[PDB]
Swiss-Prot record:
GO molecular function, one term: phospholipid binding
Official protein name in the record: Tissue factor
Gene: F3
Keyword Glycoprotein: yes
Tissue specificity: Lung, placenta and pancreas.
Organism whose genome encodes this protein: Homo sapiens (Human)
Length: 202
């Protein structure tokens, strides 16, 4: 009386990828394997009582590739039938990994303009013996949006950029607070990230 695994999910943010499934096993053990859309299967997590498996290493070898996973159920302990398994939905990294929370690196007042800079986070995607950054991986596809208002007031204004810098005209006398958000408009799924922590001048 072994049961099949169900609701297999891809937990992934900025390319660090983990597969999860249900349910928690009782006298049952699991085996997970992975394979590209066009290839053979490789086994990664062997006979475990866990309901998660880190597959980062395989997916970062080529983020534009479509992958699918599979989970087998086996009886465990002192206690038959044909192999019982379940498939996951497809997963193309470049198109569905979640964008994580951004961070303002610096902001500086220069005359009537303020310069706001976003930090360029590094990823785990390697190339030429070096780690690639979010901007390195997405290029022109990735867009940042700045939200700004006056210190203890209530209305916000916005600005967009496809580099890592904003230059906004500040109306002297007024003092600002900022917040940034990441977005890849061409997506049909996980389009935006959460907002960054607020930074105020003063």
């Amino acid at each position: 009386n072994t049961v099949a695994a169900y609701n297999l999910t891809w937990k992934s943010t900025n390319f660090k990828t983990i597969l999860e499934w249900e349910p928690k096993p009782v006298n049952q053990v699991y085996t997970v394997q992975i394979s590209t859309k066009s290839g053979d299967w490789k086994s990664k997590c062997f006979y475990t009582t866990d309901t998660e498996c880190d597959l980062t290493d395989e997916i970062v070898k080529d983020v534009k590739q479509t992958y699918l996973a599979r989970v087998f159920s086996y009886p465990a302990g002192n206690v038959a039938g044909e192999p019982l398994y379940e498939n996951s939905p497809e997963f193309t990294p470049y198109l569905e990994t979640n964008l994580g929370q951004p961070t303002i690196q610096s902001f500086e007042q220069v005359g009537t303009k303020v310069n706001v800079t976003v930090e360029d986070e590094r990823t785990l995607v390697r190339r030429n013996n070096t780690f690639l950054s979010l901007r390195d991986v997405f290029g022109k596809d990735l867009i940042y949006t700045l939200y700004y208002w006056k210190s203890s007031s209530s209305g916000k204004k916005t600005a967009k950029t496809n580099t890592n810098e904003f230059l906004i005209d500040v109306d002297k006398g007024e003092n600002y607070c900022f917040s940034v958000q990441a977005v890849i408009p061409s997506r049909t799924v996980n389009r935006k990230s959460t907002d960054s922590p607020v930074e105020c001048m003063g």
